[PDB]
Structure formats: C-alpha cells, structure tokens
Design a protein around this ligand. Sequence first.
Ligand SMILES: *[C@@H]1O[C@H](CO)[C@@H](O)[C@H](O)[C@H]1NC(C)=O
Ligand SMILES: *[C@@H]1O[C@H](CO)[C@@H](O)[C@H](O)[C@H]1NC(C)=O
Ligand SMILES: *[C@@H]1O[C@H](CO)[C@@H](O)[C@H](O)[C@H]1NC(C)=O
Ligand SMILES: *[C@@H]1O[C@H](CO)[C@@H](O)[C@H](O)[C@H]1NC(C)=O
Ligand SMILES: *[C@@H]1O[C@H](CO)[C@@H](O)[C@H](O)[C@H]1NC(C)=O
Ligand SMILES: *[C@@H]1O[C@H](CO)[C@@H](O)[C@H](O)[C@H]1NC(C)=O
Ligand SMILES: [Cl-]
Ligand SMILES: [Zn+2]
Lengths: 597, 194
Amino acid sequence: STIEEQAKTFLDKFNHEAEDLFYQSSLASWNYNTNITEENVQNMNNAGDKWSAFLKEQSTLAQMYPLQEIQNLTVKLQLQALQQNGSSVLSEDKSKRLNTILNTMSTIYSTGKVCNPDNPQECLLLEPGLNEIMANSLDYNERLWAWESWRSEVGKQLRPLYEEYVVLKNEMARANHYEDYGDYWRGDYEVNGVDGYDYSRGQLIEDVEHTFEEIKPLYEHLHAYVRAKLMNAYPSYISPIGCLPAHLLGDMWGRFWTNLYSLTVPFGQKPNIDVTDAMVDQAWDAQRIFKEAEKFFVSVGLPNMTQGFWENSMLTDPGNVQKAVCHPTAWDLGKGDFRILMCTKVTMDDFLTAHHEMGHIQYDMAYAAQPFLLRNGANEGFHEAVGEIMSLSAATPKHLKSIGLLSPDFQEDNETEINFLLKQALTIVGTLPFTYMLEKWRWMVFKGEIPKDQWMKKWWEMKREIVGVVEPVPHDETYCDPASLFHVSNDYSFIRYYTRTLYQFQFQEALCQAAKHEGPLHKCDISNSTEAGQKLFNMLRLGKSEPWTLALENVVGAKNMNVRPLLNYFEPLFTWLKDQNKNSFVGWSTDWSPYAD
Amino acid sequence: TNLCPFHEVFNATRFASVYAWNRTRISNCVADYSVLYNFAPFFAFKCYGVSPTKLNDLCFTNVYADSFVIKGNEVSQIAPGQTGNIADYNYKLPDDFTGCVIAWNSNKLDSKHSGNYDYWYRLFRKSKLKPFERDISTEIYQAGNKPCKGKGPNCYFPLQSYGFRPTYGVGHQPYRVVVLSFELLHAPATVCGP
Ligand SMILES: *[C@@H]1O[C@H](CO)[C@@H](O)[C@H](O)[C@H]1NC(C)=O
Ligand SMILES: *[C@@H]1O[C@H](CO)[C@@H](O)[C@H](O)[C@H]1NC(C)=O
Ligand SMILES: *[C@@H]1O[C@H](CO)[C@@H](O)[C@H](O)[C@H]1NC(C)=O
Ligand SMILES: *[C@@H]1O[C@H](CO)[C@@H](O)[C@H](O)[C@H]1NC(C)=O
Ligand SMILES: *[C@@H]1O[C@H](CO)[C@@H](O)[C@H](O)[C@H]1NC(C)=O
Ligand SMILES: *[C@@H]1O[C@H](CO)[C@@H](O)[C@H](O)[C@H]1NC(C)=O
Ligand SMILES: [Cl-]
Ligand SMILES: [Zn+2]
C-alpha cells in the first residue's frame, strides 16, 4: 500500500541483480588488467556496457518513487544514491558532446607529446619522460624547458575544450538543482535529517578555510627553510623573499616536495632507514611480505585473508610473456571475492605499499555485509586514509626492530627523527596548499566569480599569494595550464587529498591514545593492541549507511575535521624549524618573478 | 539385510532447487549409519531431537530425506525457529522437529565456469509459508493498490537465479544440504539398527 515498502521491494530486486552483473563486469576488468590482449578489451567493454545499461535502466525506473514519502533512513539513502541520474538529465546531444569532450581530454593528456627543439623526431611523453626529467635532473634550463613545453603543448589545446566542459557541467548542475558543478562535487559530504550531525554545502568551504588558516604557520616556516636551501643551491635564480619558481619543486606541477629531500636534508650524514638489504639478506619474497602484513593485521584482531585471496590473486609480475598494469589497486569484486594486483619488488617501499593495499582490502571486507548501494566508505576520504595509516604504523623503527628487520643495536636519536619528520613534511605539508589552491580555483571558476579572460591571471595571483610559487615564464589566457594535471583533465574531485590528510592523522592520534603509547606520535605503534583493532572495526562495519560525522566520532569522538593531530604530530619539527628560521625571512613577496628583472 | 538407497540419495547429480525441494521416502530398510559418518568431511552436523551417537539403537516407522542446495549463510539459517528469505519463502522447518541436518561443500560437481543459472530460489510470496510446504507459484506479485497485469512496474517475476562460479568466497559458496526427519510415534517400525 505504502510507497516505502515498494521501494524496499525494488531495492531487494536491484541488489541481487546488481551483485551478479557487477561481478561479471569487474571480473572482466581484472582478467583484462592481468593479461593485456584485445579480446579481453572486447569482453570488458561488453561487460561495462551491460553494467551501464543496467544502471540507467534502474535509475529510470526508480525515479518514479518520490523521496518525500520515505521515513527509513537507510532506504532513503539507498534510493537517493540510486536516483542521481547525473548526465542523463541533460539532453542527448549535449550528453554526447560532453562524452566526446571527455574522451578528447583523456587522449590529449595521455598521448600528449613534446619534442626537443633540436630533433623533431625525438619526442617524449609525460610519463615517464618529463616525469623523470623534472624528478631527477638538477639543471635549471632542462626543468624550465620541460615545464614550459609541456604546458604550452597541452594547455593551449585543452583551453576551449575546458571552457565548453565547464559550460555543460554548470548546465547539468543547474538541471540537478545545484548552483554550480563545484556544488555538485561538494554534495559528497552532505547529510540531512539526522539531528546533531547535519552539514551544509557552504560548511565544507568554511571548514577547509578555517583549517588552512590554522595549518599555514608550519607551511611558511617550511617554505622559508626550503627557500634557504634552494638559494644555497641556486644563488642566481631565487630571491631571499620572493616565491619559489614552479619548475624547482620536484614533480611536474609542485604537487609533492618528496623529491627535494636530497637537497634540503638537514643532516646528510646520518643513515636512512632502508631494510631492502634486510630483504635480500634474509631472502624475503612477496609471499613473506604479505604474510608479514597479514600477521600485522591479525595483531590488532582483524581477520585473516580468505583462501581465494592467497590462491588466485596475482602477487608477482607475471613474467614477460603476459603484460599487466600493476598500479597498486585493491579490487572488491563482490560475492566474498577480494583480490590484490601489483608488481611486488623486494624493497621497503613495496613493503609499505603492501600494507597500504591490505588495509584497503580489510576496509572493503569489513562492510561486506552491507547492501550493494552502501558498500562504500562513509565518504570518499576514508579508504585511502585507512590505507595510509597502516603504512605509517609499519614504517616505525620500533616495529622493524620487533619483526627482526632492523638490528636492535640501531641507535635512535634526535637527528634521525628530525630527518624523518622533514621527509614526512616534504611529502605531506607541501601538498596541502596546492590541493587547497586547485580545489578553490576550480570552485570559483565553476561558480562564475572569475570571467573567462582572467582565469589564469587570478590563478597565478592566488598562487603567489597563498602557496608562494611564481611562474618563471609569463603566460597569457591561451593556456589551460591547470589541465596539465591528471585530475583536472580527467574529471576527479581534488579536495579529497586535503580531507584525507586531516582524517588519517585524526585516526592516528585517536588510536595511539587508545594504544596507551607514550612519547612522540611519530614513534607510536598500534600492534598487539586488540582494543585498537576493535575501535577501528567499530567504524569499519558501518560503510556509509549512517552519516560520515557519526562514523568519525565513532573513532575520535569529534564530529568535524580538526587540525590538532597534524600540528601535534609535527610539533618537534615545528620547533626545530622555527629554531632554524630565526636568521631567514618568513613569508613571500608576490611581486618578484624570475622573468622580471 | 536390505539397505536404503542412501548412496543413491547422497550421490545424485541434479539436486533440485530450494523452491522445489525433492522429497525421498525411506522405509523397509536396515539402516547403516557409518555411511552418515564417513561420507565427506562435512561442515555442519547439528542434531536436535536425537542423540547423534545414540541413533543406531532406535527404530523408526518412516523417515524422510529432503535434498537441495543453498548458500553459505542459509546453511546456518536452516534451524528450528529462525527467520530470513530462505526460511520464510522457500523452506520452513517445524519448531518440534526431531532429526539431523547435513551440510557439506560441493565445489567440483555442482559448479562451473561462465556461470551456472540452472538453480533458482524464491524471494517473494504473499505471506509466510507453513511447515513442510511445496509451492510452485507462477503468478506475478502485487504492491498494494494497482490492479496490475503481467510484469508491471510494481509487479515482478518472483524467481531469481543462483549464479554459481568456482572463484567465489566460502560464505557465498554453494553448499549441498539434505535434512533427515524421523518420527517417534507408536506404529510398527519397519526400519531398525543391526
Ligand atoms: C592472455 O590472453 C591470451 C588470449 O586468449 C591467451 O592466449 C593467454 O594464454 C593469456 N595469458 C594468461 C592467461 O596468462
Ligand atoms: C529500515 O529497514 C530495515 C530493513 O527493512 C530495518 O532493519 C531498519 O530497522 C529500518 N529502520 C527504520 C528507521 O525504519
Ligand atoms: C588465521 O588466524 C589465526 C589467528 O591468529 C592464525 O592462528 C592462523 O594461523 C591464521 N591462518 C593461517 C592460514 O595462517
Ligand atoms: C607482539 O606480540 C608478539 C607475541 O609475543 C611478539 O612476538 C611481538 O614481538 C610483539 N610486537 C610488539 C611490537 O610488541
Ligand atoms: C558417486 O558414484 C560414483 C560411481 O557411480 C563414485 O565413483 C563416486 O565416488 C560417488 N561419489 C562419492 C562422493 O563418493
Ligand atoms: C526427485 O527428482 C527425481 C528426478 O528428477 C524424480 O524422479 C523424483 O520424483 C523427485 N522427487 C521428488 C520431487 O520428491
Ligand atoms: Cl603548476
Ligand atoms: Zn591506496
């Protein structure tokens, strides 16, 4: 009689059909990615086409249930997440225009090529050519050439395409009752109808702004130290008070400063932690690495891996006969089947990545009992954070000594931990202003506060104001330089990394408090504490059926993102850094540029 | 010294689906029960009304054996006084039942690549079933208000499929189930232990 029970029915049918269809599609994707052929491409294409047809059919059918007459919260969330028609609300002509533009962006970004000005037939891709060029070369001119050539080759092509992309995205956002596409992406963190846990679409903006306001001081201090080191290295290219050149940040866009460690290391004579020699000496292989990570997860009380995981997952490069793409990815095929695919090498890097991937696997297995439409993280930012926190825990030298990979005679000291935290800062602190920059720029572009003929002007002005980076070569509005990034050109939200950065350290602080550990957080380990495991599982089982705020409180007891874990975790590095920065200028002037003399 | 077709019931090939549970009638035997032990490593042996070691010392008038296949969780679901989609729409077991249940893992005979779609089960029925009922319905369901005809938007075909494949988890794995029912009622018992 009532409509909510009809929705219950329809969902009961949909879950069972979708389990089988999605299993078929994802198994086709797996057998493609483990074995690169053509007929595998055909099979995965057929499976994905069937899956997409099923999705559009189900959305079209279930759209007739009005949400205003559902009281059960889980049913409401299921039917809402189902009902988002997305692109199909727009006309078919504009829809095919959009998908053609998307494919055009993908082809230009993945196949963009730049040639050196001396040999027209010798040209390089971004990966691995330009990536290696600006990740390994110390020559100013080569880095500048790579940066400028890549940008002038890709952004000029992608500019009008991105303009029409934004136009259609705004149109479809206004069709779906959103003011802008940025609001469409901000809709991910939205919850309603739960007292004491609600969250508005402007609340995310306010929260991220306030958090960046608190996180800035460490950032200008690190900027000053890195500027001093770079001026020491490059006296004639860097002003003591000006912004850093873009092509001197270690990667293609200044995303991470992980590269600049070799030049900015405080103490270059202290040994670094690397148990790769321990890997080879004890003849460790992939099976032993993953059994290690297994017993690591067991130590907190998490279950074993399933027999199918060890049996059928591909734990090594499949030789040379068959080719595979082994970007570290965890696959949740459903029906109680979980898999891992990545080319294991005997290094400590792969040792950490294995723990990260198995953290993903444990997350996926924890909410396996939830229905099909809710088998996902409480929001987008929980999966990768939970993956990275296990790696952070395993990277502690205490665990290495405990598991017999570091000699007990190794002497921990202030210098080594200072080096370690500076590495972690160059990896983590460097990216936060850049992600904030890119996401806020995209947001104000979508909202319309920046007319077309000064997008890039406002972009670089705000960079020199906030991230403290100045371009080495002037650009006009003919460029689409932001599109030179994977995420910008290929339709992904980017505030996810800032949210993940806050979340992982909130989790780490909470669990380390639960583990009754004493001393610096960077030396904290959670192993052999079943209380930590049960605390983790108490949110692991939830999925996304309840508000993400409740899930966060289930772990930390707080209902919002907060910056105290980050600053507390980096505090000793903060006091060291302010100690050094007494004889250097803090802050950056926006007026100085390399090309202004 | 005539024995039951116990081999002929525990070694078939086409155990019917749960929506039509195949019933074999057992009588005029002597009842070897070492075969109830040696056959397969087993996964579940929950006996309710009879001691599982003290069964050879009993005489029964009639005994019924029902065999069908279900998923892993449903094996735990088959029990006196339970709830769920297999215990309320396909098979109901009486609260006063006295017998033993059997559950072992079938991964080599009843399993295939490219999917298996020959088996079915029923998620939709107007009400609850009564103990020991067979119901091969063919009608189309109805929501609460529409005089619908055929497979309406709120009127569905109440049969689904057990997609079976050999790369599935143990929890979703296709177990083989047969249930053994006795009757302790005063009548000439035609089956007894040696
Ligand atoms: C990859 O697929 C090709 C095409 O069928 C096949 O010949 C080859 O054996 C496969 N390699 C595997 C499964 O390792
Ligand atoms: C929603 O429905 C599910 C299953 O139908 C039930 O377990 C849950 O208690 C219901 N919750 C509310 C608030 O109605
Ligand atoms: C499964 O977990 C238990 C509990 O720690 C452990 O004893 C057992 O060895 C694990 N299984 C395997 C195959 O190692
Ligand atoms: C955890 O407990 C096990 C069992 O005694 C022990 O072998 C291992 O060294 C412990 N690890 C830590 C980090 O305490
Ligand atoms: C079923 O019968 C065949 C011969 O008809 C026999 O080989 C097989 O072992 C029997 N099944 C089992 C599980 O013993
Ligand atoms: C069980 O199946 C066999 C063969 O399909 C059939 O001959 C027999 O009558 C069935 N018994 C039932 C449905 O009780
Ligand atoms: Cl850039
Ligand atoms: Zn990951």
